[PDB]
C-alpha cells in the first residue's frame, strides 16, 4: 500500500530491467547517435523519477487512514517516513550510476555535461532529508 511497494521482493531487480529495456529501445533508433542515446536515457529516467516520486501525492487506491498522506508525495510516504532506510538509498545511488555511465559516454562534452547534470540535480534536491515537507510555492 505504497509504504511497502519498494520494500517488496525483486522490485529492485525489475527497476533495472525497465531501464535496461528503455536503453535497448533507445539504442535501436535510426537517426540517432550513440552519445545522445545516453543523453536521452539519463533525461527520461530522471524525468520519471521526479514525476513518479515527487509530484503525484496520495494513493491510486483508497487509504483507510482517512487520507493522512493525501498531501504527501510518494517519496515522503515511503516506509512511514523514516528516511535512512534500505530502499531509499538504493533509489539515490542508481541515478548516480546513470550519471557516471552518461559521464563515460558522450566523451565528457560540455553540452552533455550541462543537460545531464540538471536532471541529476533536480532529482536529488528533493531527496534531501531536510527537504521533507517544504514545497516551492505550489503543489
Amino acid at each position: 500500500p505504497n509504504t511497502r511497494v519498494m520494500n517488496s521482493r525483486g522490485i529492485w531487480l525489475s527497476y533495472v530491467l525497465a531501464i535496461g529495456l528503455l536503453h535497448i529501445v533507445l539504442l535501436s533508433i535510426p537517426f540517432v547517435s550513440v552519445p545522445v542515446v545516453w543523453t536521452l536515457t539519463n533525461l527520461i529516467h530522471n524525468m520519471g523519477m521526479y514525476i513518479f516520486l515527487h509530484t503525484v501525492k496520495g494513493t491510486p487506491f483508497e487509504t483507510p487512514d482517512q487520507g493522512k498522506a493525501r498531501l504527501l508525495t510518494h517519496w515522503e510516504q515511503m516506509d512511514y517516513g523514516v528516511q535512512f532506510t534500505a530502499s531509499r538509498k538504493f533509489l539515490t545511488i542508481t541515478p548516480i550510476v546513470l550519471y557516471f555511465l552518461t559521464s563515460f559516454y558522450t566523451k565528457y562534452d560540455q553540452i552533455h555535461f550541462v543537460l545531464n547534470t540538471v536532471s541529476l540535480m533536480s532529482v536529488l534536491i528533493p531527496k534531501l532529508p531536510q527537504l521533507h515537507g517544504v514545497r516551492i510555492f505550489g503543489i
Binding site: 535497448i24 529501445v25 539504442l27 535501436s28 533508433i29 535510426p30
Partner: peptide
C-alpha cells in the same frame, strides 16, 4: 514496431 526497428538497425 520496436522489434521491427530492432531488426533493421541490427
Amino acid at each position: 514496431s520496436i522489434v521491427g526497428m530492432a531488426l533493421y538497425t541490427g
